[PDB]
Design a binder for this molecule. Sequence first.
Ligand SMILES: CCCCCCCCCCCCCC(=O)CSCCNC(=O)CCNC(=O)[C@H](O)C(C)(C)COP(=O)(O)OP(=O)(O)OC[C@H]1O[C@@H](n2cnc3c(N)ncnc32)[C@H](O)[C@@H]1OP(=O)(O)O
Ligand SMILES: CN(C)Cc1n[nH]c2ccc(-c3ccc(F)cc3OCCn3ccnc3)cc12
Ligand SMILES: [Cl-]
Ligand SMILES: [Mg+2]
Length: 385
Amino acid sequence: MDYKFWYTQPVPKINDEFNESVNEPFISDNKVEDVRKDEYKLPPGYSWYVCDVKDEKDRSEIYTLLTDNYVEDDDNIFRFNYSAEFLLWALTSPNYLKTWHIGVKYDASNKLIGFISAIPTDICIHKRTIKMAEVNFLCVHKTLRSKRLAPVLIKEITRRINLENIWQAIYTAGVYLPKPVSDARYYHRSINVKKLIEIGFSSLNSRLTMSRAIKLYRVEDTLNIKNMRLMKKKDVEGVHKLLGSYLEQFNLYAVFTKEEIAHWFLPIENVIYTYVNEENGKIKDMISFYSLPSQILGNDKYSTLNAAYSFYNVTTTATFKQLMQDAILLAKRNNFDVFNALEVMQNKSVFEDLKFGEGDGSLKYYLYNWKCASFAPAHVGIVLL
Ligand SMILES: CCCCCCCCCCCCCC(=O)CSCCNC(=O)CCNC(=O)[C@H](O)C(C)(C)COP(=O)(O)OP(=O)(O)OC[C@H]1O[C@@H](n2cnc3c(N)ncnc32)[C@H](O)[C@@H]1OP(=O)(O)O
Ligand SMILES: CN(C)Cc1n[nH]c2ccc(-c3ccc(F)cc3OCCn3ccnc3)cc12
Ligand SMILES: [Cl-]
Ligand SMILES: [Mg+2]
């Protein structure tokens, strides 16, 4: 890899290594007044488009572009299929900017062929809290790959973020770029074993017959934490306290306001699931996971893999293993086929006992214009959608 684009950016070179005493921008003393006011140039016949994610039709356009052209697994069997309602939630968090939801249309067809987005968040990296943009949903149509459109989308969003006097960003990708601050493998816990085998995701052998595989992943339909229930509006303060305190141990986490807790955690069917255990009107334990189905490509029987992805989980009245067991059960009660988690926070400690299998790859965490020491994923305390 030459990384001809990335090496022009304020990010580490492949060989850069910083000790814990270093925790600062690559480029400081930036000036809003100096930021370019002109949009980056696109190739002839393409135009910028400002997407209105609150408009059902504009939102449907983004949904279509992602459904057809977003992230596939390494074998091109599954493609992420974020729902339209999920994209509304993900992009309209507190203080979002409509001008950070950027499309590219092909003028002659009037169709969206590219997208990139950011939302603002306070990010604590090695105990320093910085206002950052969280970048997500970069996508170029399959038919226009390897034409250098992605650097155009990246430079244009950078410019729009810089106009708001924001100079750092956080992003994640499965691909290796200069240069990860942390790298987390993903693990999967089978729920609907038979389906996962039939679609090729899971395997049998002469020892592990179909019936034996089903038995292995069987779970008791009783919670360890009996009062675990869907989160309600009244629980916002308590979730804010519980989670906000928990996250301070990590090397990388978002500093959530109360308004951010209500947005990111209050339940929305088929989008975000949060459960809480209330004692004495105080929230003592919480479970959360989001819904990210994948379209199954080329399977006669099934079109969709329903997948729950571990989000934020905190226990003070049980063991972490007991809490994540309940999280798997609650995913099962909600019709999910598989429960997915990264080896961030305390997650790795429960993978063997709760019968997770190692996946085929990892998610890399990145910062833009920030130099600092890298760290094991157990010290990562943030999950991006
Ligand atoms: C202060 C504010 C700062 C704000 C900005 C922060 C940074 C935000 C950064 C964005 C974070 C988004 C996070 C996110 O959304 C979650 S990661 C998911 C990204 N989306 C997909 O994987 C969807 C399917 N793939 C595509 O749509 C295309 O393959 C994409 C658009 C990925 C690249 O289109 P393409 O047609 O395949 O490629 P060219 O146009 O020819 O471009 C080639 C250049 O793109 C570099 N590249 C490829 N994949 C990347 C990736 N995932 N991040 C960053 N850079 C990526 C690549 O290394 C090369 O640069 P190089 O020559 O130096 O190696
Ligand atoms: C994070 N958010 C930015 C979306 C995103 N983009 N890129 C990714 C690469 C992996 C995961 C992921 C995260 C947790 C997990 F349990 C399974 C995952 O992927 C399986 C499918 N796969 C394989 C290779 N590429 C995709 C998410 C993402
Ligand atoms: Cl340029
Ligand atoms: Mg391109």
